Design a binder for this molecule. Structure first.
Ligand SMILES: [Cl-]
Ligand SMILES: [Cl-]
Lengths: 149, 8, 149, 8
């Protein structure tokens, strides 16, 4: 559980926002890319695994599960690459609700930023610092520190 | 441009 | 001190690698940019602050301390922007030794990657997971969780 | 290209 993440890809403004969610806390990282390719997804996972202890990634779709570039990055970074089948149907709804929340936030900041990527990083910051009370950024640190100890 | 990422 | 980070900019292959170091743990995040501008530094600080609880950033040089774009991101993200004067001269040497270590790592991986940005993210991963024993990625989580508690 | 970031 401390090491499980879920990938999620959503679209805005003709661009793709790729998100990684730490399942147990709801903390996220995200980036904007022109399109969702195995190379872009692989680089994002290499970034994420250098920053947090990523044990398992549930991929967002079957193309990123199949991609040998993605599997190569998961081999390099020591990540178990898994599918994203919602055996718990609660997963589908959690992800959809998170994408709607992020787009809501992006719309609330959108006019402070010329480029979408700035608005998306503002939305990551607001999401991770939101107290719901602890924030997702507090929960992820607590969860992982508890595992380490 | 009056934006955080482009103050112009 | 859980919230204090230091910016650092070093050069390789005619490109610039911008680094943020969490001073109490030595954990780092980094990116490759074509040049070190206040807009690139501001975006990097917005990313960092959405991912960790960044209270203070010691800027890498006077141009980033002066830059109103960097001050604007530090206002947005709630970061105290400070200078990077090494009142403790030990700081100077720690940064220099860190840049020499990262470049060493980057050389060791460089032929596994077509692009420099991949090699730099491999080096961030190796630096943060290295046990010196705990790793920097463990130290940062421990330090911040202890602060939250 | 036989690299992680370009398997070609
Ligand atoms: Cl796409
Ligand atoms: Cl430069």
């Amino acid at each position: 559980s401390p090491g499980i993440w879920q990938l999620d890809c959503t679209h805005l403004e003709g661009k793709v926002i790729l998100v990684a969610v730490h399942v147990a806390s709801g903390y996220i990282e995200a980036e904007v890319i022109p399109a969702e390719t195995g190379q872009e997804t692989a680089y994002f996972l290499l970034k994420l695994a250098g920053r947090w202890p990523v044990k398992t990634v549930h991929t967002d779709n079957g193309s990123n599960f199949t991609s040998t570039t993605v599997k190569a990055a998961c081999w390099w970074a020591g990540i178990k690459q898994e599918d994203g089948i919602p055996y718990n149907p609660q997963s589908q709804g959690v992800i959809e609700s998170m994408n709607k929340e992020l787009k809501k936030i992006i719309g609330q900041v959108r006019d402070q930023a010329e480029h979408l990527k700035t608005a998306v990083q503002m939305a990551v910051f607001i999401h991770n610092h939101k107290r719901k009370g602890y924030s997702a950024g507090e929960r992820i640190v607590d969860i992982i520190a508890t595992d380490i100890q | 441009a009056d934006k955080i990422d482009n103050l112009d």
